Every structure is written in structure tokens, then in C-alpha cells.
Amino acid sequence: AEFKAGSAKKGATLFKTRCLQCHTVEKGGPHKVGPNLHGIFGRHSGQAEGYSYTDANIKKNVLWDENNMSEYLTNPKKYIPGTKMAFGGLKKEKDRNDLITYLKKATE
Ligand code: HEC
Ligand code: NA
Known about the structure:
The chain is an all-alpha fold. It is built from five helices and no strands. Helix 1 crosses helix 5 and helix 3 crosses helix 5. Heme C binds next to helix 2. Its cofactor is heme c.
């Protein structure tokens, strides 16, 4: 994937309607179904403390960045076979861009 900066505000609404049910983003926000995502960019997958990950997510051992995030969110289970993240994917490129733009800022 090739991330391009988009709308953080549209990204916030996307995140809040599609991800918030399972994830928080703020520093010190709780793990829910999925892990809190603060600091996710520039951290390896499966390394948020206090969250019980699948072996598949840990073994993937991907250094999260803007580009591999876009790929992941397109089809999570395709990028990380075995993941328990039950999200079909964001198929529109503009949506992933908007979401990732938000995500970069919100996870600081
Ligand atoms: C539950 C119904 C979820 C929804 C909706 C979304 N996510 Fe998720 N995500 C969920 C789980 C259970 C997990 C852990 C998967 C595992 O196999 O252990 C995840 C994982 C992620 C990750 C990776 C986190 C890491 O520390 O490596 C990211 C980056 C992530 N999820 C982001 C994300 C976004 C942006 C969502 C909506 C667009 C989203 N998730 C939805 C559970 C669920
Ligand atoms: Na709860």
C-alpha cells in the first residue's frame, strides 16, 4: 500500500463507528476486545503489554507504519492469517487514508 494524507476528522468518525467497539486510542485507554492502540506506529505487532494476543499476531512481528497499516486494514485476516480481529476490512483507499491520518495523530 501507498498511504497518502487525508482527513483526520473523517478518520475520527470512521474510527469511532468501525473500531471503537473493540479499541481505544488514548494513552492509558483500556484494552477491550482488541488492544489499546496508543504508540502503535513504530512498535512491533503483538507487543502492547497486558493484552492476550494470538500467536499469529505475535509471530507476524511487523513494525507498524502507515503503509503496512493500510494493507492490514484492507483485509486483516489476509495480512495476518489466524488473527482473532473479526473485522472484514476497509475496502476504499480514501477511507483507509482518512482513518490512518486520524490514527497517526490520536495514538500520538
Ligand atoms: C472487534 C470486533 C474488533 C474490531 C471491530 C476491530 N478490531 Fe482491531 N483488533 C481486534 C483484536 C481482537 C485484535 C487482536 C488480534 C490478534 O490476533 O491478537 C486487533 C488487532 C488490531 C491491531 C494490531 C494491534 C497490535 O498491537 O499489533 C490493530 C492495529 C487494529 N486492530 C486496528 C483496528 C482498526 C484501525 C479498526 C477499525 C478500523 C479495528 N482494529 C477494528 C479486534 C477488533
Ligand atoms: Na466492558
